[PDB]
Coordinates of C-alpha atoms in Angstrom, one line a residue:
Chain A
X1 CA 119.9 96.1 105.2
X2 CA 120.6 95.2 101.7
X3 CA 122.1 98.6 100.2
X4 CA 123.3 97.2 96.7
X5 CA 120.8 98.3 94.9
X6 CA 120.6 101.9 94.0
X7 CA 118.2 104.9 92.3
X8 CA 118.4 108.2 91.1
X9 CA 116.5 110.5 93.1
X10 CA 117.9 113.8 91.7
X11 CA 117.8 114.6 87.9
X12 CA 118.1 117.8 85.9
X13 CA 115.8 116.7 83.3
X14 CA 113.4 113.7 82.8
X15 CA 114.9 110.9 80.9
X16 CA 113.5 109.4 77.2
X17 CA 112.1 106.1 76.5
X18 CA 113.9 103.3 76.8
X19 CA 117.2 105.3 77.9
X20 CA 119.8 104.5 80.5
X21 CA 122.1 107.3 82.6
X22 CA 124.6 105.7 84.8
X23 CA 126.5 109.0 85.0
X24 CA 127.4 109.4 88.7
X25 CA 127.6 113.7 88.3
X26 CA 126.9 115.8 91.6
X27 CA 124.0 117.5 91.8
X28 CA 123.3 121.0 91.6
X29 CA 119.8 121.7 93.4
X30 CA 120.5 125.4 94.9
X31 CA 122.0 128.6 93.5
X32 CA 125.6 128.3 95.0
X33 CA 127.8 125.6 91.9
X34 CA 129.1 122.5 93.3
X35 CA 132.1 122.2 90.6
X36 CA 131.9 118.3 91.0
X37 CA 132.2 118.7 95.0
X38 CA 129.6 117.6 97.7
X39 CA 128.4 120.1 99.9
X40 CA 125.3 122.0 100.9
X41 CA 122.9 121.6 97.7
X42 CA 125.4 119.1 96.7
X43 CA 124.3 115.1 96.9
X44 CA 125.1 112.5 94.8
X45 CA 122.0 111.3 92.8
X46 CA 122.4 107.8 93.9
X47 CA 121.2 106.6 96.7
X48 CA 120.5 103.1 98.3
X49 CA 117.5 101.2 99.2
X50 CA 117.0 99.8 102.7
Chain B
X1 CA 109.3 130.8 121.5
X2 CA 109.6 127.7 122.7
X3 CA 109.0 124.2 121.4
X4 CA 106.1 123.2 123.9
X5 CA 104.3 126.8 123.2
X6 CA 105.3 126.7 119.7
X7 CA 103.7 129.9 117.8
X8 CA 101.5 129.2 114.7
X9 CA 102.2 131.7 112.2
X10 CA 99.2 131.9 108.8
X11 CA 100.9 133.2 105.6
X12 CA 98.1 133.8 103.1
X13 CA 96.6 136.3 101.0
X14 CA 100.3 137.3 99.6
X15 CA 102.7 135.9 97.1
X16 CA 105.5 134.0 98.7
X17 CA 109.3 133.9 97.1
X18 CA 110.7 131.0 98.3
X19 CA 113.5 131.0 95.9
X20 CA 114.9 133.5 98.6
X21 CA 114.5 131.5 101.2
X22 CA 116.3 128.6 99.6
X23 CA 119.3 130.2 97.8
X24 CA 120.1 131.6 102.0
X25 CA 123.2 129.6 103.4
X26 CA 123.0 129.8 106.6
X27 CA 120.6 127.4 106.1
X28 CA 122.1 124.5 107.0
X29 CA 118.6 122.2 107.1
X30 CA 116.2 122.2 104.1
X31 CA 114.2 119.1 104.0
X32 CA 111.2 119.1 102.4
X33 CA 108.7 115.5 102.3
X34 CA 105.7 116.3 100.5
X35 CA 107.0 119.0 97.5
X36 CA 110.0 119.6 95.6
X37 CA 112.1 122.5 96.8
X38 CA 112.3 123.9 93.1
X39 CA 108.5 123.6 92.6
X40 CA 107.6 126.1 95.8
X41 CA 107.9 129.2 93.4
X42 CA 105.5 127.2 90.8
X43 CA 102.7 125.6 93.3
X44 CA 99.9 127.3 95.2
X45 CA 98.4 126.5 98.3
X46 CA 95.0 127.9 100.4
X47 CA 97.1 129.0 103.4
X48 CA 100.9 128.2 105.1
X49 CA 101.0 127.2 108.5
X50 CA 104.6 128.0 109.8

């Protein structure tokens, strides 16, 4: 399993043409804040292909 | 009940806030593969099957 390439599958917003985000921020997909911490509703927004 | 004799429960003719159902944390499972969990309070569907 080749794991070095990686995509965003989390994103507050849709991105513009021809515009690159390589910011690795956490997450926030539920009501509770993460403050930058993993957790429930907390998950990094890159993830690895198999 | 149990999982051999699992009970179907219909939700339909009603208006479903699922934004309470998510925000709970003693959740600790939410895993949706067909929808987004932020899109449940924007979709409809016929009936629910649960």
């Amino acid at each position: 399993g080749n794991y070095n390439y990686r995509y965003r599958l989390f994103r507050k917003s849709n991105l513009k043409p021809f515009e690159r985000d390589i910011s690795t921020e956490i997450y926030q997909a539920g009501s509770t804040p993460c403050n930058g911490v993993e957790g429930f509703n907390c998950y990094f927004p890159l993830q690895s292909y198999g | 009940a149990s999982v051999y004799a699992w009970n179907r429960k219909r939700i339909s003719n009603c208006v479903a806030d699922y934004s309470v159902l998510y925000n709970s944390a003693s959740f600790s499972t939410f895993k949706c593969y067909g929808v987004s969990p932020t899109k449940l309070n924007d979709l409809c569907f016929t009936n629910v099957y649960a």
